[PDB]
Design a protein around this motif. Structure first.
Motif, PDB file in Angstrom:
ATOM      1  N   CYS A 198      -4.830   0.491   6.614  1.00  8.91           N
ATOM      2  CA  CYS A 198      -5.291   1.690   5.924  1.00  8.91           C
ATOM      3  C   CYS A 198      -6.776   1.660   5.598  1.00  8.91           C
ATOM      4  O   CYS A 198      -7.387   2.728   5.485  1.00  8.91           O
ATOM      5  CB  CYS A 198      -4.509   1.891   4.619  1.00  8.91           C
ATOM      6  SG  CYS A 198      -2.785   2.407   4.811  1.00  8.91           S
TER       7      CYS A 198
ATOM      8  N   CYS B 226       0.831  -1.201   0.000  1.00 11.95           N
ATOM      9  CA  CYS B 226       0.000   0.000   0.000  1.00 11.95           C
ATOM     10  C   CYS B 226       0.868   1.254   0.000  1.00 11.95           C
ATOM     11  O   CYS B 226       1.796   1.354   0.811  1.00 11.95           O
ATOM     12  CB  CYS B 226      -0.939   0.018   1.203  1.00 11.95           C
ATOM     13  SG  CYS B 226      -0.154   0.125   2.830  1.00 11.95           S
TER      14      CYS B 226
ATOM     15  N   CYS C  77       1.688   3.193   7.433  1.00  9.77           N
ATOM     16  CA  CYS C  77       2.305   1.875   7.480  1.00  9.77           C
ATOM     17  C   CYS C  77       3.041   1.471   6.213  1.00  9.77           C
ATOM     18  O   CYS C  77       3.264   0.272   6.022  1.00  9.77           O
ATOM     19  CB  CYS C  77       1.252   0.805   7.799  1.00  9.77           C
ATOM     20  SG  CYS C  77      -0.085   0.640   6.585  1.00  9.77           S
TER      21      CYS C  77
ATOM     22  N   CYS D  59      -5.694  -2.999   2.145  1.00  5.90           N
ATOM     23  CA  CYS D  59      -4.774  -2.899   3.270  1.00  5.90           C
ATOM     24  C   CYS D  59      -5.571  -2.951   4.566  1.00  5.90           C
ATOM     25  O   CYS D  59      -6.524  -2.186   4.744  1.00  5.90           O
ATOM     26  CB  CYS D  59      -3.951  -1.613   3.203  1.00  5.90           C
ATOM     27  SG  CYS D  59      -2.978  -1.290   4.699  1.00  5.90           S
TER      28      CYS D  59
HETATM   29 ZN   LIG Z   1      -1.474   0.483   4.721  1.00  4.17          ZN
END
Ligand SMILES: [Zn+2]
Lengths: 225, 30, 95, 72
Positions: free
Chosen positions: D67, D44, D49, D64
């Motif tokens: 996310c 992602c 992250c 994700c």
């Molecule tokens: Zn992510």
RNA sequence: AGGAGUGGAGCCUGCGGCUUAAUUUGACUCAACACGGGAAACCUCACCCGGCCCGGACACGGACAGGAUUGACAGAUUGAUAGCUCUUUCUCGAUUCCGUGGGUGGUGGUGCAUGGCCGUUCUUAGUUGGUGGAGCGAUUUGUCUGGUUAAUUCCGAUAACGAACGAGACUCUGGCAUGCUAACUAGUUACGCGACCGGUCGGCGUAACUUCUUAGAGGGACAAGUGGCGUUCAGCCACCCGAGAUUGAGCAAUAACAGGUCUGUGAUGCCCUUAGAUGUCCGGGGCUGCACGCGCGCUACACUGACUGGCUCAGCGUGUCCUACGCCGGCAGGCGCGGGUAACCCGUUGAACCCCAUUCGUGAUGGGGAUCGGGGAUUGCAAUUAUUCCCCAUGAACGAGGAAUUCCCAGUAAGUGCGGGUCAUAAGCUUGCGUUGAUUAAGUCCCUGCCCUUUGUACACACCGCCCG
């Protein structure tokens, strides 16, 4: 932007009502008997009246330094503005609260009720009180509650002169079977210009001055100083 | 700091335990 | 309870010897722990845990909890936060 | 009032038990005998992250978990 | 003796009943029933139909970092954009998760297990030691035959004498002070400037001060003076002077009640329940439903009035929601600037009855407004089982109320409005305030109830007793 005075004079009594309740549940077993607030513009002082002054500050003063820090967080004082001081009640026998809490720690420790109550009346009267009444209510004998009342001396009940000539205290003591109520009323002496008792006399008491004895003259004499 | 025979007798002089509270109060007195 | 929140609560009580909270489980932020995003519920339920072990003593009045550290609390939070033994709560440093 | 005990409902709800997957790190990296690795999971492009957090290879989307970003 | 009534009608609100999934519940003569500040759309909320969460500390045992656990898009599902659940595969890093224990929270039960508070006996005039006298002491006197008082208040009498609580005193409030201390956050008088026809000006600015306003101190009323009555005492009646010759409230004894409150409380003992909960949150309902009975009330039944205009006067209170000013609206109501944390602004609080002119003309009438249909506007997330408000229209019962029954003695009854509490939106309730303002009485024990003395008793759980067939 400030507050109305109607709301300001009220909010100063709600603050003083909760502080007394908080200190009551905190220092009761140490002789707590009242609080006084002095709003100095630089430093707000709080005086705590108690019997055992050593059990209020504690060793090294590690207890009143805890109170002065837990009080300002609760009431939003700036750091260093509020200071708590501990002092001694002038006479312990004439304070109703200090006797309604003394008798609670005798009923909570295995004393007989009849002897616990006479030990309080005796100390009240021997300290200079004009009268005393102690009432204990609850389940003292079995599953049925009843009241024991112990009186000694004079005791007034009616009028305005009762608002300053008597001191009243009501307390709860939690036993294994229930709750007992303890009521202590103390009628104070006069003590003109004195710390104990009201300076005002009783509204019905008339004091007549004994005249200075004099000898009325028999013959006329002029003194030509 | 035990029990009080005076209070015991005064509170139980008319109940089932009257004969015992009288005996305990007499023991305390004499 | 995130470990960051638990650490933040524990090392704030250490500087003083006291803690204050309001019995309000839906208050989204504790006023002394703002900018760290620590809810008021977490403080309540952490001081509930520290009390049950005996390390603190509480007092409740008018919707408010007042907690105090005990001698077994300074001894226990000194090892939890790995603080130097030259750290003492503000209550213990005066007079 | 008086207590009336009616416990009847459409049987009983069952709380979702998670599945214990062993060594999920294995399937993200393909390692040959020459040392070079291949990344089998698409990643992602975010900031919270990124650089280490792989997305979900579903039948129609990439997703994700942290996310909550979904590419269809 | 009377006044206004209630009981009859319409409606508003509480109780039974009857319904209901639920229509949560406490309280039943005075001492329940506009009471639980209880005017509940949601919350409140307990009640009903469902659905998430744990906010189950702590101790021990297990599993587990080759992961205990944590959360989540989309399809389905769901009332729901509830990862609640099914399918599916990424994060989260010992905080959790599983068993045992014992903890917690309950507007869950017991007010007949309790505390505190309140109500009642009782707002009556009662109650009690000490020393002395009498006695079989169980007791008794004091604490009383009699006058008097609102009063066991006093006088007097007197085997009792001294006291105490209650009553009284006391506190707050109303009425008086041209005497005192003060005032730009109160005014008055005077003088100027100004407007208008010496007059009016709440038009504007200065100096005289405290009559008016505000609030502190001190005075002032004591049956004190006179005339009567009274064992010439205690006191009662009339009158002069005088602001006033009883203003109204707060407080309030010993001893009790199985009086109300566990639903006000981190007051509280036991019992119950505690993870498909009696905890807690969310969604929707109910508390208001309606054949019928029972209590507080609000409007009326009209001319001593209603309608339409005009004129003219308060006090107690609230306010960082109370609002002036200007513009659009018939209005309810909307937009822009301002003031006020207040004797500073709403506000010199231009209130209603009252008062002066007009129309109506004894009639279910223009009285009276229930009920219902269309619109419009506000509060709110949500107004549909109409929240409140407005505008047209609709126009019922009711022609003064049976047996019964309530409250009331002078700024009182009744009439009339205003403020506070409740309140986002809200008064037919309550709690205060002013305005207009009387008839009849100043007596009694007949009805109701309480208190006292003498007397009888086979009663004493005390006549709801005991007791013979
Ligand atoms: Zn992510």
């Amino acid at each position: 932007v400030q507050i109305s005075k109607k709301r300001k004079f009220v909010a100063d009594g709600i603050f003083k009502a909760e502080l007394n309740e908080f200190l009551t549940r905190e220092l009761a077993e140490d002789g707590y008997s009242g609080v006084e607030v002095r709003v100095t513009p630089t430093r707000t002082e709080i005086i705590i009246l108690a019997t055992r002054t050593q059990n209020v500050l504690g060793e090294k003063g590690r207890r009143i330094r805890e109170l002065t820090a837990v009080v300002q967080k609760r009431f939003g004082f700036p750091e260093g503005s509020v200071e708590l001081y501990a002092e001694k009640v002038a006479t312990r026998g004439l304070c109703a609260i200090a006797q309604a809490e003394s008798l609670r720690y005798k009923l909570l420790g295995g004393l007989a009720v009849r002897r616990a109550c006479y030990g309080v009346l005796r100390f009240i009267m021997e300290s200079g009180a004009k009268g005393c009444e102690v009432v204990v209510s609850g389940k003292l004998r079995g599953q049925r509650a009843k009241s024991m009342k112990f009186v000694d001396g004079l005791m007034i009940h009616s009028g305005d002169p009762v608002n300053y000539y008597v001191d009243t205290a009501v307390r709860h003591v939690l036993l294994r079977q229930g709750v007992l109520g303890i009521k202590v009323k103390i009628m104070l002496p006069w003590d003109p210009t004195g710390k104990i008792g009201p300076k005002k006399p009783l509204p019905d008491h008339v004091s007549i001055v004994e005249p200075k004895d004099e000898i009325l003259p028999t013959t006329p004499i002029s003194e030509q100083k | 700091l035990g029990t009080d025979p005076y209070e015991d007798f005064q509170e139980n002089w008319n109940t089932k335990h009257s004969s015992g509270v009288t005996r305990e109060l007499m023991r305390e007195l004499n | 309870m995130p470990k960051k929140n638990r650490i933040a609560i524990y090392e704030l009580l250490f500087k003083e010897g006291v803690m204050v909270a309001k019995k309000d489980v839906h208050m989204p932020k504790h006023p002394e722990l703002a900018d760290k995003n620590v809810p008021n519920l977490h403080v309540m339920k952490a001081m509930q845990s520290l009390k049950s072990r005996g390390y603190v003593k509480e007092q409740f009045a008018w919707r408010h909890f007042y907690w105090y550290l005990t001698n077994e609390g300074i001894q226990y939070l000194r090892d939890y936060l790995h603080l130097p033994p030259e750290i003492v709560p503000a209550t213990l440093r005066r007079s | 009032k008086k207590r009336k005990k009616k416990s009847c409902t459409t049987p009983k709800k069952n709380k979702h038990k998670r599945k214990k997957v062993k060594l999920a790190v294995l399937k993200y990296y393909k390692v040959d005998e020459n040392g070079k690795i291949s990344r089998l999971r698409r990643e992602c492009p975010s900031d919270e992250c990124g650089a280490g957090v792989f997305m979900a290879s579903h039948f129609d989307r990439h997703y994700c978990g942290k996310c909550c970003l979904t590419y269809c």
